[PDB]
RNA sequence: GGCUAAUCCCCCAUGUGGACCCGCCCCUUGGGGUGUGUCCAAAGGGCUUUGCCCGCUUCCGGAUGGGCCCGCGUCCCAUCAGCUAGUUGGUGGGGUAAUGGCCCACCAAGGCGACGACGGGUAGCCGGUCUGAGAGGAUGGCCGGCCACAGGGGCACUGAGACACGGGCCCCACUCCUACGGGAGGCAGCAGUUAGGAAUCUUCCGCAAUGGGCGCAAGCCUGACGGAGCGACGCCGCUUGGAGGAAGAAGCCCUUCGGGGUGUAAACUCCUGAACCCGGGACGAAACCCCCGACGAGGGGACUGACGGUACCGGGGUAAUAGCGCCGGCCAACUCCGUGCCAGCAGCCGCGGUAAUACGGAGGGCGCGAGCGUUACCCGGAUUCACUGGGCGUAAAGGGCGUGUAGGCGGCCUGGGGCGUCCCAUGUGAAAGACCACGGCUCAACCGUGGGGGAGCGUGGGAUACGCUCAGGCUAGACGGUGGGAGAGGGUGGUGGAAUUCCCGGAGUAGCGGUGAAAUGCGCAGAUACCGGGAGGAACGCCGAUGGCGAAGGCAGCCACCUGGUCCACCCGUGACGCUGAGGCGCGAAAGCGUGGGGAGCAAACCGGAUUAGAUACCCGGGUAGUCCACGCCCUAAACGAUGCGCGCUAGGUCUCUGGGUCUCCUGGGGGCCGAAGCUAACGCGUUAAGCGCGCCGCCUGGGGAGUACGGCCGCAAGGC
RNA sequence: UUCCCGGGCCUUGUACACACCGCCCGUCACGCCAUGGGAGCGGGCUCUACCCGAAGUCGCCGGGAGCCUACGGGCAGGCGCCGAGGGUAGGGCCCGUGACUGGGGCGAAGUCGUAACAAGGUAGCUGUACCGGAAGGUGCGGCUGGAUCCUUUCU
């Protein structure tokens, strides 16, 4: 049993991008799908699609990278430089609308789950709602 | 430690022990001398240091360093303890204050007279 | 003992009304209405006395003030683990303004505790304050709010209100009066004395202002208060002069004897004018009162200072206090002389035993400046208790291993709820402080006016992604079914061969043994060596591996039985049944203990022989406990991978054990070696992570003191935790 | 080319680095404060059983046993529960003193050894156990955090 399936998605993605994979499969749930929708819209991934693997439904996240590089270490820059969990089971975190973090002076995002649904930080301030603070990504 | 463990147990604030029981919280303490001795310094140096055993107003009895050059302190003279130690002498935690009570300020001393308790020389 | 007044006490009356029992209605805890019945009021005083004023009485309401109750929050020690007799509830009662074990009788046997009861230690709490980037840490002086106390302990009376600081009764300690019988006291009120202490003020002025008590008022009281006094204790403002003045006087300082410094600094020139003298001189202060009007409104309209002749304005007027720390690094400021492990400095590192930029003066320099240093304490730094924001292979740190209780944590889909969570509205968040703005003292400190901010909690409304919950599905986790497998996994019984020792027998002599050499020792009672037979105990050669199994400790001859774990195939069954696990419970090498066995070899202690300067050791000869078995304790370890368990993710290559397969190879599960990415202080780790993540448990916080002391618990002891 | 002296190169171990004429361990004697143990003693608090019990509220009596009366009752007075504190007997906490001793930690440096660091000269460490002037030796089991295929001290 994955103890925190959301963290597991984020990590799967982290390890994937770090070895420069073209894609990764993460076991699927509507909530994960929401998160992904936000990443995709936000430019971090090429987007994702649903697949079946041995009959069991997954999500291919397609990974995005910078171009090749000069000198030693031609490996391209990362599009997701950083991805991390905030609220985890066992310490849960909730921001009011006035506690929503400005992530890397705004070149990053924070993904919140709210009662209006899963939004970015800007998205939530504009909507004007607080919620469970899920990922921090930049 | 896990957060659950921090709820269950939590961090421990760190108590510190007072390097000066002048007791009382007091900044200084008055006492009477007992022994006025000379003392041998700890291994890295050599000298003859002037220290005095003191019975305080706190019911405490301790050796105290006599700073400056000359000192008029004797067996029954009464004195004021300062605090601060001498790194190279075993077991002496406090200082004598010159110029207070029977402790006489350092004679002839012209340089830093705030410490050592000497007053200002007149020049014409 | 006697006289006497009243707004002092008592008895009838009137009952607006109210209290009380009983009934009824509404309301819903004892709120409100109502009917009968019983019960309850008052005081008079002053004027201009045919009217008003000050009062009195019963009631309803308001206002302000308080009582009691509940949720939540509020320090340290678990070396404080059990606490509890009015103690927990009940019925009835007493008490109060009022609920209540608040108190009493009787009844039941409860109530609380690891979510830390009970115990011990410290402590008034808050608004706030200091510090901090913040989170946090620390604190609660002054000012405001609340509490508690008034020499110590108990108690009630009076009253709207007290269990009453300048009220009362009693007990104790202390001081004083005493005709020795008995009495009087109570500054933690303002000043002041005394003691203690490093240390903390005047036995001042005034009720002019504000406020409080009584009074119709005039007025009286007011050490509340408004001022003044003392202390650089803190904050703010100000002075010790301004301009000119040598390519630079003297003195002192260094010197390469050329000169460099103190330095425009001084002298001196000129100018302003702190103090000080002289004169004017406050606001703070208009009410209460008086007059008109109706003692209202309104209109007018006079008295009233402590501070104080102080602030301030005007005039005049003199160049007129500087100190303290520091100058090796941190750290801004360097040179001579003096002193030579001295005298001394010192926050740490460390200076000084003849060139000392570190000691001591001097010149010069830096820093602040009516101050400057020191000591003590708090936060800071210190991300060094890490929520933000740390760690545990070798640095301190993974519990010896497991089982599992509380607890923490929880796959995918749908729905109800809306507890967490989020949003809106509203109440609350006093003032002061803090922030912003404007303003008042010439400025500021200080003060006023206004604005904004705000966590938290109350109420109403709303959202449903996540967390929760309830219900209903699912099968990817987990378990199960069928079949097949490897194994020193455990327990019980049996049996085999080798070797040692010993005993019997044969044969056979003069030694054997042992060491670097030797000796002790054994041998003519015939040893060693050799052959045959017997007894007995312990351990299992080759196979054997860089192997296998087990949670660990650990487990090797062979056979049988009893028994645990595990892996693969099939994709069959259940349907999230999961992970971790404080406490508990069990297991746990060796040595050790108890009772009883057993005893070959080995062997602590011990006995001897050597060696050596000595030998108490290593080396040699003997040898007891022990080693073995049964049962019961002990519970340690380099119990080591010095690496907690579980799950997902992240190149490969090579060797191997063991299953399945279309068996050049592929695919599970183990064991190793190299090595992507990455980690790491490095060494190293690297799909058997020390990588990337999540959950949960254990543990760490400089070394020595010390795994000591004391306390507890366990143990027969040793000794363990 | 084994050995003696001096030396060069690669490698290995180290706790040395004034660098093996190095380090460091312990004993005993000796120069220091602190600690426990500390018999008892001096006293403070609190707990429990019993006994004594001021004040004061509260309950009862209040009688040809007092005082007032309108005869309803009132007061004085008496008794009782409660009760501050006191005493007796032991249980704990705490402070002062303290016969008596444990080691400690450096401390003028002496003493006898050589245990550890190099295969430290018998590899070390280790739980335990007996032993010994002292570092220690030895037994059993373990660990690698061990080198490279007679004895012989110290500076
Ligand atoms: Mg949904
Ligand atoms: Mg898409
Ligand atoms: Mg966070
Ligand atoms: Mg009379
Ligand atoms: Mg009379
Ligand atoms: Mg009369
Ligand atoms: Mg009356
Ligand atoms: Mg009447
Ligand atoms: Mg009526
Ligand atoms: Mg009624
Ligand atoms: Mg009636
Ligand atoms: Mg009358
Ligand atoms: Mg009323
Ligand atoms: Mg109230
Ligand atoms: Mg406190
Ligand atoms: Mg203790
Ligand atoms: Mg009782
Ligand atoms: Mg009772
Ligand atoms: Mg009953
Ligand atoms: Mg009752
Ligand atoms: Mg009352
Ligand atoms: Mg609780
Ligand atoms: Mg406090
Ligand atoms: Mg107190
Ligand atoms: Mg602040
Ligand atoms: Mg601040
Ligand atoms: Mg703060
Ligand atoms: Mg606080
Ligand atoms: Mg506090
Ligand atoms: Mg206070
Ligand atoms: Mg106050
Ligand atoms: Mg209050
Ligand atoms: Mg009291
Ligand atoms: Mg007093
Ligand atoms: Mg007293
Ligand atoms: Mg009292
Ligand atoms: Mg009254
Ligand atoms: Mg009183
Ligand atoms: Mg009181
Ligand atoms: Mg008084
Ligand atoms: Mg009296
Ligand atoms: Mg005095
Ligand atoms: Mg004094
Ligand atoms: Mg004053
Ligand atoms: Mg006066
Ligand atoms: Mg007045
Ligand atoms: Mg007045
Ligand atoms: Mg009045
Ligand atoms: Mg009048
Ligand atoms: Mg008076
Ligand atoms: Mg005053
Ligand atoms: Mg002074
Ligand atoms: Mg001063
Ligand atoms: Mg000038
Ligand atoms: Mg000159
Ligand atoms: Mg000159
Ligand atoms: Mg002039
Ligand atoms: Mg005025
Ligand atoms: Mg005026
Ligand atoms: Mg007027
Ligand atoms: Mg008139
Ligand atoms: Mg008027
Ligand atoms: Mg008027
Ligand atoms: Mg007046
Ligand atoms: Mg005046
Ligand atoms: Mg003037
Ligand atoms: Mg003038
Ligand atoms: Mg002048
Ligand atoms: Mg400097
Ligand atoms: Mg100095
Ligand atoms: Mg000289
Ligand atoms: Mg010199
Ligand atoms: Mg020198
Ligand atoms: Mg100097
Ligand atoms: Mg210096
Ligand atoms: Mg100097
Ligand atoms: Mg100078
Ligand atoms: Mg100033
Ligand atoms: Mg100061
Ligand atoms: Mg600090
Ligand atoms: Mg901190
Ligand atoms: Mg910080
Ligand atoms: Mg520290
Ligand atoms: Mg942390
Ligand atoms: Mg936080
Ligand atoms: Mg650390
Ligand atoms: Mg080590
Ligand atoms: Mg370690
Ligand atoms: Mg372990
Ligand atoms: Mg360990
Ligand atoms: Mg459970
Ligand atoms: Mg979930
Ligand atoms: Mg809700
Ligand atoms: Mg709804
Ligand atoms: Mg609000
Ligand atoms: Mg405010
Ligand atoms: Mg103010
Ligand atoms: Mg202000
Ligand atoms: Mg301003
Ligand atoms: Mg202004
Ligand atoms: Mg203000
Ligand atoms: Mg304001
Ligand atoms: Mg406001
Ligand atoms: Mg609400
Ligand atoms: Mg609501
Ligand atoms: Mg809904
Ligand atoms: Mg739902
Ligand atoms: Mg859910
Ligand atoms: Mg749950
Ligand atoms: Mg279900
Ligand atoms: Mg099925
Ligand atoms: Mg299965
Ligand atoms: Mg089948
Ligand atoms: Mg089977
Ligand atoms: Mg077996
Ligand atoms: Mg045999
Ligand atoms: Mg024979
Ligand atoms: Mg013989
Ligand atoms: Mg013969
Ligand atoms: Mg013989
Ligand atoms: Mg024969
Ligand atoms: Mg034979
Ligand atoms: Mg036998
Ligand atoms: Mg046999
Ligand atoms: Mg073998
Ligand atoms: Mg093996
Ligand atoms: Mg089996
Ligand atoms: Mg098969
Ligand atoms: Mg199936
Ligand atoms: Mg089914
Ligand atoms: Mg488990
Ligand atoms: Mg356990
Ligand atoms: Mg055992
Ligand atoms: Mg054993
Ligand atoms: Mg035995
Ligand atoms: Mg035996
Ligand atoms: Mg033997
Ligand atoms: Mg032997
Ligand atoms: Mg011997
Ligand atoms: Mg025995
Ligand atoms: Mg024995
Ligand atoms: Mg046994
Ligand atoms: Mg860990
Ligand atoms: Mg498991
Ligand atoms: Mg491999
Ligand atoms: Mg095969
Ligand atoms: Mg493998
Ligand atoms: Mg295994
Ligand atoms: Mg490697
Ligand atoms: Mg690499
Ligand atoms: Mg890391
Ligand atoms: Mg893993
Ligand atoms: Mg690591
Ligand atoms: Mg320490
Ligand atoms: Mg320690
Ligand atoms: Mg031990
Ligand atoms: Mg003990
Ligand atoms: Mg015992
Ligand atoms: Mg013992
Ligand atoms: Mg032991
Ligand atoms: Mg014992
Ligand atoms: Mg050679
Ligand atoms: Mg060469
Ligand atoms: Mg070389
Ligand atoms: Mg080694
Ligand atoms: Mg080296
Ligand atoms: Mg050396
Ligand atoms: Mg020695
Ligand atoms: Mg002796
Ligand atoms: Mg009585
Ligand atoms: Mg009674
Ligand atoms: Mg009567
Ligand atoms: Mg009576
Ligand atoms: Mg009694
Ligand atoms: Mg008593
Ligand atoms: Mg002693
Ligand atoms: Mg050695
Ligand atoms: Mg040895
Ligand atoms: Mg050795
Ligand atoms: Mg040997
Ligand atoms: Mg031995
Ligand atoms: Mg041993
Ligand atoms: Mg061994
Ligand atoms: Mg080793
Ligand atoms: Mg020798
Ligand atoms: Mg020696």
Which two structure tokens, joined as six digits, stand for B47?
């000298």
Among B105, B94, B89, residue whose Cα is nearest residue B47: B89
Residue identified by tokens 């970015």 is A120
Query: What residues in A contact B3, CB-CB < 8 Å?
Result: 90-91
Deposited resolution, Å: 3.5
Q: Encode A88-110: b = buried (16+ Cβ within 10 Å), e = exposed.
A: eeeeeeebeeeebeebeeeebbb
**Any idea which architecture B1-124 has in CATH?**
Beta Barrel (2.40)
Distance B39 CA to D28 C1' (A): 28
Experimental method: X-ray
* Cα separation values, B40 from B53, B62, B83, B86, Å: 15, 17, 20, 12
Positions in chain D where some atom is under 7 Å from a protein CB: 32-33, 106-108
| Distance from C-alpha of A118 to C-alpha of A6, rounded to nearest angstrom | 13
Is B114 an interface residue toward A (CB < 8 Å)? no
- How far does A41 lie from chain B, in Å, by closest CA? 34
- How far does B115 lie from chain A, in Å, by closest CA? 54
B64 and B94 Cβ atoms separated by less than 8 Å: yes
| Distance from C-alpha of B113 to C-alpha of A40, rounded to nearest angstrom | 76
At A6, is the secondary structure helix, strand, or coil?
A: helix
Among B99, B100, B102, B124, residue whose Cα is nearest residue B113: B99
Distance B15 CA to C382 C1' (A): 14
Domains recognised in chain A with CATH numbers: 3-80 (3.30.1370.30), 81-138 (3.30.1490.10)
Query: What residues in B contact A92, CB-CB < 8 Å?
Result: none
B43 touches strand D (CB under 7 A): yes
């Amino acid at each position: 049993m994955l103890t925190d399936p959301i963290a597991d998605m984020l990590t799967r993605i982290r390890n994937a991008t770090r070895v420069y994979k073209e894609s990764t499969d993460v076991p699927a749930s509507r909530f994960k799908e929401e998160i992904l929708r936000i990443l995709a819209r936000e430019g971090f991934i090429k987007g994702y699609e649903r697949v079946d693997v041995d009959g069991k439904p997954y999500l291919r996240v397609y990974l995005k990278y910078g171009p090749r590089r000069q000198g030693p270490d031609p490996r391209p820059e990362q599009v997701i430089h950083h991805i991390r969990r905030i609220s985890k089971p066992g310490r849960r975190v909730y921001v009011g609308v006035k506690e929503i973090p400005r992530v890397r002076r705004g070149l990053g995002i924070a993904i919140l789950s709210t009662s209006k649904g899963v939004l970015t930080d800007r998205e939530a301030r504009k909507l004007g709602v607080g919620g469970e603070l899920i990922c921090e990504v930049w | 430690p896990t957060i659950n463990q921090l709820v269950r147990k939590g961090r421990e604030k760190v108590r510190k022990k007072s390097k000066v029981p002048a007791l009382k919280g007091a900044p200084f303490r008055r006492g009477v001398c007992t022994v006025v001795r000379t003392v041998t310094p700890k291994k890295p140096n050599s000298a003859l240091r002037k220290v005095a055993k003191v019975r305080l107003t706190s019911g405490y009895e301790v050796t105290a360093y006599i700073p400056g050059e000359g000192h008029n302190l004797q067996e029954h003279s009464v004195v004021l303890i300062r605090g601060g130690r001498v790194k190279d002498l075993l077991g002496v935690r406090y200082h004598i204050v010159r110029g207070v009570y029977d402790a006489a300020g350092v004679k002839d001393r012209k340089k830093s007279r705030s410490k050592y308790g000497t007053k200002k020389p007149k020049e014409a």
